[PDB]
Motif scaffolding. Structure first.
Motif, short mmCIF file in Angstrom:
data_model
loop_
_atom_site.label_atom_id
_atom_site.label_comp_id
_atom_site.label_asym_id
_atom_site.label_seq_id
_atom_site.Cartn_x
_atom_site.Cartn_y
_atom_site.Cartn_z
N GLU A 192 0.85 -1.17 0.00
CA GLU A 192 0.00 0.00 0.00
C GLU A 192 0.89 1.23 0.00
OE1 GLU A 192 -1.74 1.13 3.91
OE2 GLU A 192 -3.66 0.82 2.89
N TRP A 193 0.37 2.38 -0.37
CA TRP A 193 1.16 3.59 -0.30
C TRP A 193 0.51 4.62 0.60
CZ3 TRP A 193 6.01 4.42 -2.30
CH2 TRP A 193 6.49 5.73 -2.24
N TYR A 194 0.89 4.59 1.87
CA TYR A 194 0.64 5.68 2.78
C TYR A 194 1.99 6.12 3.26
CZ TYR A 194 -4.46 5.54 3.17
OH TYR A 194 -5.81 5.63 2.92
N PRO A 195 2.53 7.18 2.69
CA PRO A 195 3.89 7.56 2.96
C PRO A 195 4.02 8.38 4.23
CG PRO A 195 2.99 8.96 1.24
CD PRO A 195 1.87 8.09 1.74
N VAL A 196 5.06 8.08 4.99
CA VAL A 196 5.36 8.81 6.21
C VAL A 196 6.86 9.01 6.32
CG1 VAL A 196 3.34 7.96 7.47
CG2 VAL A 196 5.51 6.73 7.64
N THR A 254 12.26 8.43 4.43
CA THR A 254 11.01 8.25 3.71
C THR A 254 10.53 6.81 3.78
OG1 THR A 254 11.66 9.94 2.10
CG2 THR A 254 9.88 8.45 1.46
N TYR A 255 9.34 6.62 4.32
CA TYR A 255 8.72 5.33 4.37
C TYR A 255 7.57 5.24 3.39
CZ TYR A 255 11.47 4.44 8.53
OH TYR A 255 12.51 4.24 9.42
N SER A 256 7.60 4.20 2.57
CA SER A 256 6.60 3.99 1.52
C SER A 256 5.21 3.69 2.09
CB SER A 256 7.07 2.83 0.63
OG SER A 256 8.30 3.14 0.01
N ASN A 257 5.17 3.16 3.30
CA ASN A 257 3.92 2.79 3.95
C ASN A 257 4.18 2.41 5.40
OD1 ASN A 257 4.61 -0.25 3.79
ND2 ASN A 257 4.51 0.30 1.63
N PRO A 258 3.12 2.22 6.22
CA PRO A 258 3.28 1.78 7.61
C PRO A 258 4.17 0.55 7.74
CG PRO A 258 0.99 2.34 7.19
CD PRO A 258 1.71 2.47 5.87
N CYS A 259 3.99 -0.41 6.83
CA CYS A 259 4.80 -1.63 6.81
C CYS A 259 6.28 -1.29 6.67
CB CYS A 259 4.34 -2.53 5.66
SG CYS A 259 5.37 -4.02 5.38
N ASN A 260 6.59 -0.31 5.83
CA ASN A 260 7.97 0.15 5.63
C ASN A 260 8.52 0.71 6.94
OD1 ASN A 260 9.52 1.90 2.81
ND2 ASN A 260 10.44 1.24 4.73
N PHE A 261 7.72 1.53 7.61
CA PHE A 261 8.10 2.14 8.88
C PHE A 261 8.30 1.06 9.95
CE2 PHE A 261 6.86 4.03 12.99
CZ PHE A 261 7.52 5.24 13.02
N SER A 262 7.32 0.16 10.05
CA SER A 262 7.36 -0.90 11.04
C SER A 262 8.53 -1.84 10.80
CB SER A 262 6.04 -1.68 11.01
OG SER A 262 6.04 -2.76 11.93
N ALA A 263 8.64 -2.35 9.57
CA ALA A 263 9.64 -3.38 9.27
C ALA A 263 11.04 -2.85 9.41
CB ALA A 263 9.44 -3.92 7.86
N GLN A 264 11.27 -1.66 8.87
CA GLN A 264 12.60 -1.09 8.89
C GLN A 264 13.03 -0.83 10.32
OE1 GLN A 264 15.01 -1.18 7.36
NE2 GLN A 264 16.16 0.69 7.01
N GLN A 265 12.12 -0.33 11.12
CA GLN A 265 12.44 0.04 12.48
C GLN A 265 12.54 -1.16 13.41
OE1 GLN A 265 9.81 3.30 13.37
NE2 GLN A 265 10.57 4.32 11.53
N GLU A 266 11.69 -2.16 13.22
CA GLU A 266 11.78 -3.36 14.03
C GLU A 266 13.10 -4.08 13.76
OE1 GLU A 266 8.94 -6.54 11.69
OE2 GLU A 266 8.03 -4.68 12.40
N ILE A 306 7.03 8.91 13.86
CA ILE A 306 6.66 9.54 12.61
C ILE A 306 6.89 11.04 12.71
CG2 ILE A 306 4.83 9.94 10.92
CD1 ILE A 306 3.49 7.40 11.85
N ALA A 307 7.79 11.54 11.87
CA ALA A 307 8.15 12.95 11.88
C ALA A 307 7.04 13.78 11.25
CB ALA A 307 9.46 13.16 11.14
#
Length: 50
Positions: free
Chosen positions: A13-17, A24-36, A44-45
């Motif tokens: 999905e594309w919800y960028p944050v 730059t995170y492409s989606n929540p999954c990007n934020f979650s996965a990268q950070q975990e 989230i800035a």
């Protein structure tokens, strides 16, 4: 992973944050996965790709 820098690619999905690293995170999954894997401690800035 412990130490990894950038974005970890996920594309459900594309919800960028932007993460507090200024990343730059492409989606929540990007934020979650990268950070975990890397940095769970950033927040989230702002909404929208960085």
């Amino acid at each position: 992973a412990e130490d990894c820098v950038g974005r970890k690619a996920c594309t459900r999905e594309w919800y960028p944050v932007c993460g507090s690293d200024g990343v730059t995170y492409s989606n929540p999954c990007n934020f979650s996965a990268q950070q975990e894997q890397c940095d769970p401690n950033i927040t989230i800035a702002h909404m929208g790709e960085c």
